[model samples]
Target: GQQPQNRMMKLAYLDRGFYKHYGIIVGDHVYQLDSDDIFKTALTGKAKFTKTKLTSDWVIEEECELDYFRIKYLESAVDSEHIFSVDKNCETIAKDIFGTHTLSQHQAIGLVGTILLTAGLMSTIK
Candidate 1:
């Protein structure tokens, strides 16, 4: 049984293939909007997500097959406590949560240059 006091919710990230998913994490559980399902329905011009209002919480119910009702976030309290390297599988999964983006060559160089400059400045001062 779930207790009322144990229902604290927080935002969490997901990386599945080309899409980056965001969802609510409540303790060890996760709940997400069915974006893929909703997107496809929207194309038909008859898709409307129904809202169920609660005193303290709300729900958006839509038509379509949701990915899963009990999909796990793949991390535990222990994993949340430590940092991992970029090339590591966990880190790669985390990076995917932010999804893919494109940047012009100049933009890419400028961004990296700014970070390097800041790193150098901090190193010299220490």
Candidate 2:
């Protein structure tokens, strides 16, 4: 049986710029936002999911409780209102549910890189 004492927020790195995924771990189950096609979700559209994952864990309390996640998931489409947008990726959503503070080791650095790239693009216009 699943243990009540074991619950956490999990994050997974998928190998890309903003390829990190976030979720809430309750007992042996998980809850998160992402698409089924997976890659298409990357284009930034409607958000989706509350299924499961198996890595990375956090205390996850204060603003977002286990019920908070569950309610929030049911709170929309994935299983509506919250369509994943430009700055509203998994990381952002997690913070919105969990707290308004978080980061992605990859996305963070990638964003920095993105800024650098974009800066060059603007100045060089190439």
Candidate 3:
């Protein structure tokens, strides 16, 4: 692991059939997750997703398919962790638990960031 100062890394992920690794610059902050975050909301709160609330009128038969539950229970953790990891920081928590992912409305991009976010967090303590 790199020291807690301007740490940069090369990250790889699938982007529309093209494998891409972008520069992940980590400054000095650490990422954290929230209880009300989509991950928590989906797994523990309520299952409203894919443009429909699980309890609302859009609850289609396909939406309630067993596979959806299977994915939510089994396959969603990795994606959630990846998301939480990327946007972790003190400012984020102070601002909001999931300030980063909020930009994409909790769309799991399979990567997280905090390299420079750390600097912002550290700047507040002193």
Predicted structure with the largest lDDT when compared to the true one: 2
| Candidate 3 lDDT over residue span 1-126, tens digit each | 543332232221112122111122112211222222333332442222111112211111111122222223222433444334443435445544555444332433222223222322333342
TM-score, ranked from best to worst: 2, 1, 3
**Candidate 1's C-alpha lDDT?**
0.31
* RMSD from true fold, candidate 3: 18.6
How would you encode candidate 1's per-residue C-alpha lDDT over 47-102 as one tens digit per residue?
11111112223222222222232222222212233222212335333444343655
TM-score per candidate, in order? Answer: 0.25, 0.32, 0.16
Off by over 4 Å in 2: 1-18, 36-39, 53-64, 67-126
Candidate 3 Cα deviation (angstroms), residue 26: 2.7
How well is each residue in 16-124 modelled by candidate 2, as lDDT tens digits? 2333333445455554554433345444433444455444443333222343333333333333333434344576446543564554333333232233222222333
Higher-TM-score candidate of 1 and 2: 2
Q: What is the lDDT of residue 61 in candidate 2?
A: 30
Please report, in order, the local distance difference test score of every candidate based on alpha carbons: 0.31, 0.39, 0.27
In Å, residue 8's CA in model 2 sits off its true spot by: 5.8
Clashes of each: 0, 2, 8
Q: Is candidate 1 or candidate 2 better by lDDT?
A: 2
